[PDB]
Amino acid sequence: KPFVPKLVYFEPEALSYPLGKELYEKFTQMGIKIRETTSHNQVRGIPGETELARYRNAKSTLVVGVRRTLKFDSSKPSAEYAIPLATGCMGHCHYCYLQTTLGSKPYIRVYVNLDDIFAQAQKYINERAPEITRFEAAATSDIVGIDHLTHSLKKAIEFIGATDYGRLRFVTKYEHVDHLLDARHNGKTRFRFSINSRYVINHFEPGTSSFDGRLAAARKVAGAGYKLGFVVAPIYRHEGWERGYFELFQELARQLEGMDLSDLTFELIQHRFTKPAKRVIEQRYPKTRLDLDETKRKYKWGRYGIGKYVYRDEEAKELEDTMRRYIEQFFPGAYVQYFT
Numbered sequence: 026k027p028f029v030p031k032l033v034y035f036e037p038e039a040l041s042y043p044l045g046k047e048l049y050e051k052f053t054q055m056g057i058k059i060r061e062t063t064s065h066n067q068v069r070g071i072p073g074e075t076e077l078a079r080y081r082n083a084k085s086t087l088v089v090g091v092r093r094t095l096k097f098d099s100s101k102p103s104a105e106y107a108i109p110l111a112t113g114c115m116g117h118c119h120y121c122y123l124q125t126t127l128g129s130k131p132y133i134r135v136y137v138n139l140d141d142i143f144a145q146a147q148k149y150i151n152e153r154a155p156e157i158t159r160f161e162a163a164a165t166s167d168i169v170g171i172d173h174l175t176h177s178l179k180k181a182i183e184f185i186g187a188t189d190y191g192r193l194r195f196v197t198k199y200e201h202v203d204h205l206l207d208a209r210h211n212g213k214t215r216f217r218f219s220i221n222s223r224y225v226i227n228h229f230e231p232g233t234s235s236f237d238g239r240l241a242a243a244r245k246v247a248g249a250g251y252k253l254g255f256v257v258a259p260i261y262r263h264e265g266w267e268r269g270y271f272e273l274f275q276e277l278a279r280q281l282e283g284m285d286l287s288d289l290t291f292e293l294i295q296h297r298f299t300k301p302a303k304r305v306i307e308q309r310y311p312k313t314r315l316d317l318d319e320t321k322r323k324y325k326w327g328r329y330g331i332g333k334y335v336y337r338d339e340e341a342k343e344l345e346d347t348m349r350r351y352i353e354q355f356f357p358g359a360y361v362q363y364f365t
């Protein structure tokens with residue numbers, strides 16, 4: 026069940042680094058089809074005659090390259106910066122906002138020059154010290170779901186664990202966390218899981234681990250000493266959402282009863298979509314129940330790029346207040362970091 030690619034691309038320069046050498050040896054030993062590419066941002070010859078075929082095949086394709094853009098993007102409100110360990114995901118969440126993010130690729134991409142990346146991370150920490158600097162490792166990927174192949178996240182966790190003023194955080198929809206349990210995190214990593222109503226998970230989250238799988242992993246990471254959190258997103262106003270999300274928090278509390286939840290955190294993100302989302306999503310998921318009706322939404326204009334549609338102010342406030350009530354009921358003391 027853990028992700029294994031059916032096609033792997035390598036940058037020639039990637040083989041000069043330990044991870045690239047290790048991955049090349051791994052996949053050749055497995056007999057998997059391996060190709061060369063000049064740049065990880067320009068991958069040619071992904072099989073498929075239709076757009077849907079090429080998209081689906083890309084989702085089973087791994088690309089191993091070198092990170093050359095060492096300037097870290099901002100990752101607010103989650104963290105100060107996004108640490109770039111990987112990009113892309115094997116999941117097929119119908120609503121995934123990465124689909125329409127500028128310059129996003131459907132294939133999974135891992136970076137091998139971890140010395141350069143952690144060194145730059147340390148520079149950002151030093152620049153802000155003694156203030157705390159948080160890094161988001163899953164801003165443009167499901168870093169946890171991919172990590173059993175590389176252990177790049179494990180190395181990042183222990184790198185941050187050794188720092189005085191550095192903190193790490195990431196969120197996942199995958200249960201494959203066994204290799205991370207003995208990591209020397211030193212209490213400086215927030216391990217989060219994306220959760221949602223039964224409606225949203227069943228209809229819009231194929232190719233990910235089940236709710237029970239995510240919670241089993243949540244119990245594992247909490248027992249291993251990680252700081253635990255949840256991300257309720259996308260908060261989606263489906264038919265019967267009020268009761269749907271009520272039963273989510275009720276079941277979440279039931280599956281976490283007995284554990285210490287004094288330092289538990291919640292993050293809330295309402296469903297959002299961009300102008301090109303409808304054409305992209307309808308092409309990739311023709312039978313989706315996802316409502317992308319812009320006429321009943323509020324548009325927030327972009328700054329340097331394009332904007333996004335979110336629920337109207339009164340609908341958004343209704344979602345926020347209701348979610349805060351459920352968290353207050355089932356998890357008293359737990360901290361809601363934000364609603365957006």
Ligand SMILES: C[Se@@+](CC[C@H](N)C(=O)O)C[C@H]1O[C@@H](n2cnc3c(N)ncnc32)[C@H](O)[C@@H]1O
Pocket residue numbers: 114120121122123163164165166167168196197198218219220256257258259260294295296297298
């Ligand atoms: C980009 Se997701 C990367 C991390 C990992 N692969 C994961 O799924 O947890 C980060 C979060 O954002 C949510 N999310 C994704 N799309 C949307 C969206 N369109 N509207 C509102 N929220 C959206 C997802 O449910 C995640 O909780």
Ligand code: SF4
Pocket residue numbers: 113114115116117118121122123165166167198233
């Ligand atoms: S698991 Fe996360 S990154 Fe992957 S498709 Fe779903 S929302 Fe997107």
